[PDB]
A and B are shown apart, each in its own frame.
Chain A
């Protein structure tokens, strides 16, 4: 067992996501971070096993074998950072081992929608990033038009009117 924190983090483009991880056995003070995007194979992000900091480009990691506590710091968060981050402890003196992961953390990096004005067509588009049988609606989607350099949220009169709608909405 390796306990991760939190269930989910949410960072704005440019901010820094910071995660936690704790081992309960004194013989497991050698940690890994593995990142996995949806329906894709996990990739190793970085190792620690040493009492210090460890800067791997845009990533910093702090370990304290003393209290078996680790941290991963994703600074200057990219949109392409939104993923499931796993953490595992390896055993001291093994030399043939399975990576045994914790429950993992879902990170959601979002863009700050400057100049938005929400509207439903029943698609609710161009809105605030803080706003979160017969009818069905899936969660937000960040569509980013690289050609026009414009990124937009997405998701028949009062159908979408189940959650909270802003006070500046066209219909």
Chain B
């Protein structure tokens, strides 16, 4: 398991970002991969032992990848275009080629002009009376001003029956700094809906070291 932490990071333009990676032990071939809006996976750099090797065209002049002994493997954006806002993946290999590369969970970067637009979302958990009387099955929908867009709406855990949208929907698409809205429904029985006896969204906003 190759670890990345953290995970969901929001940075203001002009100030450098450090992306930490903790690769699998015994591996000595490292990689950085960029994926924006979740479309195309892109190779940036590969590191081995003490120095870089292949730096791709996408590896900006403002980037730097170090690995001191004892510490992490760190890509450092310094600094720090609004074009950098994407997802970066760390990777381990052990063999230089022809063998599995192990990818991290990725870090969601969000470079922004004005950080004053960062506002948490409001959760809003009613079962349809027409649904249960017609099919004895009752859907409960949770649906609102998120930015940008670190939410993860869940039910309390009940990873069964519930589904969620594949990606949030930008409320005002015509604008650059738009709020996002995502949908998530859970299906309940006639015996589950009618019983008298939490929809939380894990959001990532401003850090504990910000004014």
Chain A positions within 8 Å of B, measured between CB atoms, are 30, 36, 38-44, 47, 49, 86, 90-91, 94-101, 103-104, 117, 119, 121, 123, 125-126, 136, 138-139, 141-148, 150, 152, 154, 170
B128: interface (CB < 8 Å):
yes
Among B142-164, those with CB < 8 Å from A are 160-164
Could you mark each residue 54-84 of chain B with 1 if its beta carbon is under 8 Å from any beta carbon of chain A, else 0? Answer: 1010000000000000000000000000000
Number of B positions contacting A (CB below 8 A): 45
Contact A96 B29 (CB under 8 A): yes
28 contacts between A and B (CB under 8 A): A36-B41, A38-B38, A38-B167, A39-B38, A39-B87, A41-B103, A41-B106, A43-B103, A47-B98, A90-B97, A95-B97, A96-B29, A96-B46, A96-B96, A97-B96, A97-B98, A98-B31, A99-B43, A101-B40, A123-B185, A136-B169, A139-B165, A141-B163, A141-B165, A143-B185, A144-B163, A150-B187, A170-B134
For B40, what are the chain A residues with a Cβ–Cβ distance below 8 Å? 101, 103-104
Instruction: Tell me if B160 and A154 are in contact (CB < 8 A).
Output: no
Q: Is B124 an interface residue when CB atoms closer than 8 A count as contact?
A: no
- Residues of A with C-beta under 8 A to B189: 148
Query: Is A96 a contact of B97 with CB atoms below 8 Å?
Result: yes
Top 9 nearest A-B pairs by Cβ distance?
Answer: A96-B96, A41-B103, A98-B43, A97-B97, A145-B161, A143-B163, A44-B100, A141-B163, A95-B96
Q: Counting chain B CB atoms within 10 Å of each CB, which of A94, A95, A152 scores highest? A: A152
Q: Are A126 and B141 in contact (CB under 8 A)?
A: no
Question: Which residues of B from 24 to 48 have beta carbons under 8 Å from A?
Answer: 29, 31, 38, 40-41, 43, 46, 48
Chain B residues within 8 Å of A152, by CB: 137, 187
In the complex, whether B196 has a CB less than 8 A from a CB of chain A is: no
Considering the chains assembled together, what is the distance between the CA atoms of A138 and B141 in angstroms? 13
Number of A-B residue pairs, CB cutoff 8 Å, is: 111
A162 to chain B, nearest CB (A): 16
Known: A41-B105, A96-B29. A138 touches B139 (CB 8 A): no
Provide the bound-state CA to CA distance between A154 and B137, in Å.
Answer: 13
**Residue numbers in A under 8 Å from B178 (CB-CB):** none
Known: A96-B29, A98-B56, A142-B163. 12 other contacts (CB 8 A): A43-B103, A44-B100, A44-B101, A95-B97, A95-B98, A97-B97, A98-B54, A101-B40, A104-B41, A119-B131, A138-B165, A139-B166
A25 to chain B, nearest CB (A): 15
Complex CA distance for A97 and B30, rounded to whole angstroms: 10
